Amino acid sequence: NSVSMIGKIAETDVSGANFDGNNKLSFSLFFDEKIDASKGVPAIQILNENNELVKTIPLKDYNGQKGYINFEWDGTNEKGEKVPKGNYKIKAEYNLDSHSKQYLQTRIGRGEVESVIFDKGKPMLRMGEMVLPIDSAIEFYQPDQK
Amino acid sequence: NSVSMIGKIAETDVSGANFDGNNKLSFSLFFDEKIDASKGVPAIQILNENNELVKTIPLKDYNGQKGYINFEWDGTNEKGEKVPKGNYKIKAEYNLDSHSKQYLQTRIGRGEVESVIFDKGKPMLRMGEMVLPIDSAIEFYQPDQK
Amino acid sequence: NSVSMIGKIAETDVSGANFDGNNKLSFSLFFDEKIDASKGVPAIQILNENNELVKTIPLKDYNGQKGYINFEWDGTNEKGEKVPKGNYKIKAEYNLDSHSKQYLQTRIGRGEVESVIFDKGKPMLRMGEMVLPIDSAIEFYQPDQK
Amino acid sequence: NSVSMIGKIAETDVSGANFDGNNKLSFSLFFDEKIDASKGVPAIQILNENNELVKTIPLKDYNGQKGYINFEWDGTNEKGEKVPKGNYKIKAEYNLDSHSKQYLQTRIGRGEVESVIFDKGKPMLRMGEMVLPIDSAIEFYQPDQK
């Protein structure tokens, strides 16, 4: 019955993406603030089931963008070799703060709730490309905060 | 208990209208953006239970309007002959996009939720002239999006 | 669980007030628009259980006000004589529209929802002076509309 | 399912804080309007389980601030002596109104709802540093009102 979330930022229990072993993997990250390439080196970190860094994708070419941005991953590691199938965490660091010496942060499975969908009887959140059940959401707050 | 949907755009499972066989049929269509007659030929298409085009109503005279607009249909086809009673789909195309070569779209049974009504204990959505049960709604989002 | 109504206009199934037979009766009416004394003769009509006009209270002295306004009724009719105890409907007409020749309207038991209260476990709506259970509400919409 | 309360001011059944008997006690108070040191003497009152004033913390140094402010209490009384462990109420008075001769008021366990969190399946309100279950909330309203 509640669609009050629409427009709020949502955080979910989905932090990872399944890689089938072969085919490339499209995914969406939400950037609360505008990407500034001059402030640090912004990038995406792709991590395996044991927190091992497997691929790093630089974000510098997306300077000046904000909000949902789509990306692909060929499924290869840093050397260029295909990785084992499985679940992989996808996080990002951007906009090094001059004062605090800290990067702003984001990851797969959080972002602005753009619409609410009822699939059969059940409710579902559209968060860019991702469409998740309501029960997966673990926190809500307004933009430009937290 | 939730009226959070007031002000949101709603999409419902109601896509059609029953024509009794004789009396004219009033109906409401919601226009998200302002009708521009210079951009394509805007019109309403009225379709029977087998997707056969039965009547076309030109929208050019409503240039410059937006939001809910009311319309009538005498129940006649393009030749001027009354059609069988039954259920008829009502869609519209407007504002041909110069770049994409695609029309914006709307139909009966979607639009801004203007109020929420409680019939007996049960809740209902006012969407222009139409008043539908909440359970009929299949998606919600904010205006000027999707 | 839902407080989304706060800030919306609410309409309830409470349309009347009990008069005990003797003591005066305080009550609250909500004025969607600013009272204009030059446009018609604005007033409150007090009606008994059989729709009989019992007292009329002129509103002209409240020109220029809007929103919740409090009033009292001594419990007397137009002649000055105390009326039978019981339930009495309280409506008002104000701001005669020059074009439509129609008065704007309001009554006891509708208005802006100013807060939501949880009394013991149960939820409750503050609507000026009146505090009603949520189940009494029969419609919701935003200000300056309907 | 409802997060409509995000952005609203909340009042809860939590009015006190447990002091363990030794370690200092961090806490948050919400200031609806900007602290004006020139208007009265603004301060926090800390009260024991029998409404006995135990410590007073002056607020004058926080002139010009508004919203959630964090504070600590060493757990000592006005003489400088550690107090018995237990539950202690924490209220504040600020901004003496020239006309009414009354202080504005606040206390621990009310304020703006900044986010909504789901612990396991269950919902929770972030109100500055405090995180409370939804069931603890006893009233909601919009800012700058009540």
Side-chain angles (χ1 to χ4, degrees), chain A residues 1-4 6-7 112-119 126, chain B residues 1-5 8 134 137-142 145-146:
Chain A
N1 293 326
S2 198
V3 307
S4 62
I6 298 170
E112 188 181 324
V113 177
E114 295 178 314
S115 79
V116 171
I117 293 151
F118 289 82
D119 233 35
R126 191 210 303 288
Chain B
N1 292 326
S2 73
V3 305
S4 41
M5 54 214 86
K8 305 296 185 282
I134 72 173
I138 63 165
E139 180 181 28
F140 295 89
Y141 48 86
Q142 274 147 5
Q145 297 162 29
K146 174 48 144 68

Short mmCIF file of all heavy atoms in Angstrom, two decimals, chain A residues 1-4 6-7 112-119 126, chain B residues 1-5 8 134 137-142 145-146:
data_model
loop_
_atom_site.label_atom_id
_atom_site.label_comp_id
_atom_site.label_asym_id
_atom_site.label_seq_id
_atom_site.Cartn_x
_atom_site.Cartn_y
_atom_site.Cartn_z
N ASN A 1 0.78 -1.29 0.00
CA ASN A 1 0.00 0.00 0.00
C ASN A 1 0.80 1.32 0.00
O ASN A 1 0.21 2.34 -0.33
CB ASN A 1 -1.02 0.04 1.17
CG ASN A 1 -2.15 -0.97 1.02
OD1 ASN A 1 -2.60 -1.29 -0.08
ND2 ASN A 1 -2.64 -1.48 2.15
N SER A 2 2.08 1.33 0.42
CA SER A 2 2.89 2.56 0.49
C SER A 2 3.91 2.76 -0.62
O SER A 2 4.79 1.94 -0.83
CB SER A 2 3.63 2.59 1.83
OG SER A 2 4.07 3.87 2.11
N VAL A 3 3.79 3.92 -1.28
CA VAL A 3 4.70 4.38 -2.32
C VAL A 3 5.38 5.68 -1.91
O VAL A 3 5.96 6.38 -2.73
CB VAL A 3 3.95 4.61 -3.65
CG1 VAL A 3 3.16 3.37 -4.04
CG2 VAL A 3 3.02 5.82 -3.60
N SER A 4 5.35 5.97 -0.61
CA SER A 4 5.99 7.17 -0.05
C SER A 4 7.48 7.26 -0.29
O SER A 4 8.05 8.34 -0.37
CB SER A 4 5.78 7.23 1.47
OG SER A 4 6.36 6.13 2.13
N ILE A 6 9.05 6.60 -3.10
CA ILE A 6 9.37 7.19 -4.40
C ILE A 6 9.99 8.56 -4.17
O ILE A 6 9.42 9.38 -3.47
CB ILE A 6 8.16 7.43 -5.31
CG1 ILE A 6 7.45 6.11 -5.66
CG2 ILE A 6 8.60 8.09 -6.62
CD1 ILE A 6 6.11 6.25 -6.36
N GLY A 7 11.16 8.79 -4.77
CA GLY A 7 11.93 10.04 -4.60
C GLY A 7 12.99 10.04 -3.50
O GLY A 7 13.93 10.83 -3.55
N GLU A 112 18.26 6.35 -5.79
CA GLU A 112 16.96 6.98 -5.78
C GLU A 112 15.92 6.00 -6.28
O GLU A 112 16.13 5.28 -7.26
CB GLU A 112 16.94 8.22 -6.67
CG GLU A 112 15.64 9.01 -6.54
CD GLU A 112 15.58 10.24 -7.43
OE1 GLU A 112 16.61 10.92 -7.64
OE2 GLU A 112 14.46 10.53 -7.90
N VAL A 113 14.79 5.96 -5.58
CA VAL A 113 13.67 5.13 -5.99
C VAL A 113 12.88 5.92 -7.03
O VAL A 113 12.27 6.93 -6.71
CB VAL A 113 12.81 4.78 -4.79
CG1 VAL A 113 11.59 3.97 -5.20
CG2 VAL A 113 13.65 4.01 -3.80
N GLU A 114 12.91 5.45 -8.27
CA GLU A 114 12.32 6.22 -9.38
C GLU A 114 10.84 5.90 -9.63
O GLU A 114 10.06 6.77 -10.10
CB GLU A 114 13.15 5.99 -10.65
CG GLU A 114 14.56 6.55 -10.55
CD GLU A 114 15.37 6.28 -11.79
OE1 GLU A 114 15.35 5.12 -12.29
OE2 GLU A 114 16.05 7.21 -12.25
N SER A 115 10.46 4.67 -9.33
CA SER A 115 9.06 4.26 -9.43
C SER A 115 8.79 3.08 -8.49
O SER A 115 9.72 2.48 -7.96
CB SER A 115 8.71 3.93 -10.89
OG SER A 115 9.17 2.66 -11.25
N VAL A 116 7.52 2.77 -8.27
CA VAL A 116 7.13 1.57 -7.53
C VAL A 116 6.20 0.76 -8.43
O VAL A 116 5.23 1.29 -8.97
CB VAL A 116 6.41 1.90 -6.21
CG1 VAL A 116 5.82 0.64 -5.58
CG2 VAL A 116 7.38 2.53 -5.25
N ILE A 117 6.48 -0.54 -8.53
CA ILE A 117 5.81 -1.44 -9.46
C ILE A 117 5.13 -2.54 -8.67
O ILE A 117 5.63 -2.95 -7.65
CB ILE A 117 6.81 -2.06 -10.43
CG1 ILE A 117 7.36 -0.96 -11.34
CG2 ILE A 117 6.19 -3.17 -11.28
CD1 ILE A 117 8.77 -1.24 -11.82
N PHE A 118 3.96 -2.98 -9.13
CA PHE A 118 3.27 -4.12 -8.52
C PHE A 118 3.29 -5.26 -9.51
O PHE A 118 2.63 -5.19 -10.55
CB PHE A 118 1.87 -3.73 -8.12
CG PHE A 118 1.85 -2.79 -6.95
CD1 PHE A 118 2.05 -1.43 -7.13
CD2 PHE A 118 1.67 -3.26 -5.67
CE1 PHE A 118 2.06 -0.56 -6.03
CE2 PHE A 118 1.67 -2.39 -4.56
CZ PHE A 118 1.87 -1.04 -4.74
N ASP A 119 4.12 -6.27 -9.20
CA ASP A 119 4.34 -7.44 -10.07
C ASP A 119 3.49 -8.51 -9.47
O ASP A 119 3.67 -8.91 -8.30
CB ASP A 119 5.82 -7.91 -10.12
CG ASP A 119 6.36 -8.03 -11.55
OD1 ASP A 119 5.97 -7.20 -12.40
OD2 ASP A 119 7.24 -8.91 -11.81
N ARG A 126 11.82 0.35 -8.49
CA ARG A 126 12.69 0.61 -9.61
C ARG A 126 13.77 1.57 -9.13
O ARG A 126 13.47 2.67 -8.68
CB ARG A 126 11.97 1.17 -10.81
CG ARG A 126 12.85 1.19 -12.06
CD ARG A 126 12.50 2.31 -13.02
NE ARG A 126 11.10 2.26 -13.45
CZ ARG A 126 10.58 1.36 -14.29
NH1 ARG A 126 11.32 0.38 -14.82
NH2 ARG A 126 9.29 1.42 -14.60
N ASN B 1 -4.66 2.50 4.65
CA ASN B 1 -3.97 3.54 5.48
C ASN B 1 -3.02 4.50 4.76
O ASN B 1 -2.72 5.55 5.32
CB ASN B 1 -3.20 2.90 6.66
CG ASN B 1 -4.12 2.28 7.72
OD1 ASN B 1 -5.21 2.77 7.98
ND2 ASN B 1 -3.65 1.20 8.35
N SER B 2 -2.51 4.16 3.56
CA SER B 2 -1.59 5.06 2.81
C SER B 2 -2.20 5.81 1.58
O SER B 2 -2.82 5.23 0.67
CB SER B 2 -0.30 4.33 2.45
OG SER B 2 -0.53 3.42 1.44
N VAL B 3 -2.00 7.12 1.63
CA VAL B 3 -2.44 8.07 0.61
C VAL B 3 -1.23 8.75 -0.02
O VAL B 3 -1.34 9.81 -0.65
CB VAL B 3 -3.39 9.15 1.23
CG1 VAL B 3 -4.56 8.49 1.94
CG2 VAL B 3 -2.69 10.10 2.18
N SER B 4 -0.06 8.15 0.18
CA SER B 4 1.23 8.67 -0.34
C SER B 4 1.22 8.85 -1.87
O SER B 4 1.92 9.68 -2.42
CB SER B 4 2.35 7.73 0.08
OG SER B 4 1.95 6.37 -0.04
N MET B 5 0.41 8.02 -2.51
CA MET B 5 0.19 8.08 -3.95
C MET B 5 -0.48 9.32 -4.50
O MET B 5 -0.42 9.54 -5.70
CB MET B 5 -0.60 6.86 -4.41
CG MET B 5 -1.90 6.62 -3.67
SD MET B 5 -2.13 4.83 -3.57
CE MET B 5 -1.20 4.48 -2.10
N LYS B 8 1.23 11.52 -7.33
CA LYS B 8 2.00 10.63 -8.19
C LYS B 8 1.20 10.34 -9.44
O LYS B 8 0.00 10.46 -9.44
CB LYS B 8 2.26 9.28 -7.50
CG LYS B 8 2.92 9.30 -6.14
CD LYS B 8 4.31 9.86 -6.21
CE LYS B 8 4.96 9.76 -4.84
NZ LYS B 8 4.49 10.83 -3.93
N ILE B 134 -7.79 0.55 -5.36
CA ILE B 134 -6.31 0.69 -5.25
C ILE B 134 -5.67 -0.51 -5.90
O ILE B 134 -4.64 -0.39 -6.53
CB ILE B 134 -5.75 0.89 -3.80
CG1 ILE B 134 -5.82 -0.40 -2.94
CG2 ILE B 134 -6.51 1.98 -3.08
CD1 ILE B 134 -5.14 -0.32 -1.57
N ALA B 137 -4.21 -0.58 -9.46
CA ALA B 137 -2.99 0.16 -9.79
C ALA B 137 -1.80 -0.76 -9.85
O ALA B 137 -1.55 -1.54 -8.93
CB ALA B 137 -2.73 1.22 -8.74
N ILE B 138 -1.05 -0.64 -10.95
CA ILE B 138 0.09 -1.53 -11.20
C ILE B 138 1.44 -0.84 -11.19
O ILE B 138 2.46 -1.51 -11.13
CB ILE B 138 -0.08 -2.33 -12.50
CG1 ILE B 138 -0.14 -1.42 -13.73
CG2 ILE B 138 -1.35 -3.18 -12.41
CD1 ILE B 138 0.05 -2.13 -15.05
N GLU B 139 1.48 0.48 -11.22
CA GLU B 139 2.74 1.21 -11.10
C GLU B 139 2.51 2.66 -10.70
O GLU B 139 1.49 3.25 -11.04
CB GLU B 139 3.48 1.14 -12.42
CG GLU B 139 4.82 1.87 -12.42
CD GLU B 139 5.55 1.81 -13.76
OE1 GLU B 139 4.87 1.70 -14.81
OE2 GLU B 139 6.80 1.89 -13.73
N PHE B 140 3.48 3.22 -9.99
CA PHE B 140 3.46 4.64 -9.58
C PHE B 140 4.80 5.29 -9.86
O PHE B 140 5.84 4.66 -9.68
CB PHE B 140 3.15 4.78 -8.07
CG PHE B 140 1.77 4.32 -7.66
CD1 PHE B 140 1.55 3.01 -7.30
CD2 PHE B 140 0.69 5.20 -7.65
CE1 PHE B 140 0.28 2.59 -6.94
CE2 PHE B 140 -0.58 4.79 -7.28
CZ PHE B 140 -0.79 3.48 -6.92
N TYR B 141 4.79 6.55 -10.27
CA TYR B 141 6.03 7.33 -10.40
C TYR B 141 5.72 8.82 -10.34
O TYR B 141 4.56 9.19 -10.41
CB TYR B 141 6.76 6.97 -11.69
CG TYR B 141 5.89 6.94 -12.92
CD1 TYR B 141 5.65 8.09 -13.64
CD2 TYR B 141 5.32 5.76 -13.38
CE1 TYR B 141 4.85 8.08 -14.78
CE2 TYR B 141 4.51 5.74 -14.52
CZ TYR B 141 4.29 6.90 -15.22
OH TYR B 141 3.47 6.92 -16.33
N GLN B 142 6.73 9.69 -10.21
CA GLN B 142 6.45 11.14 -10.16
C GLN B 142 6.30 11.72 -11.55
O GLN B 142 6.86 11.18 -12.50
CB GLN B 142 7.53 11.91 -9.42
CG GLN B 142 7.29 11.94 -7.93
CD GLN B 142 8.56 11.95 -7.11
OE1 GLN B 142 9.67 12.03 -7.65
NE2 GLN B 142 8.41 11.85 -5.79
N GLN B 145 8.52 12.08 -15.65
CA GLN B 145 9.52 11.01 -15.59
C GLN B 145 8.93 9.71 -16.18
O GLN B 145 7.72 9.60 -16.46
CB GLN B 145 10.03 10.82 -14.14
CG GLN B 145 10.77 12.03 -13.57
CD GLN B 145 10.87 12.00 -12.05
OE1 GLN B 145 10.90 10.94 -11.42
NE2 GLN B 145 10.93 13.18 -11.45
N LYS B 146 9.80 8.74 -16.44
CA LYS B 146 9.42 7.46 -17.05
C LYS B 146 9.30 7.64 -18.53
O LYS B 146 8.37 8.27 -18.95
CB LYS B 146 8.13 6.88 -16.42
CG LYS B 146 7.58 5.60 -17.10
CD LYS B 146 8.78 4.63 -17.27
CE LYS B 146 8.46 3.16 -17.09
NZ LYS B 146 7.60 2.56 -18.15
#
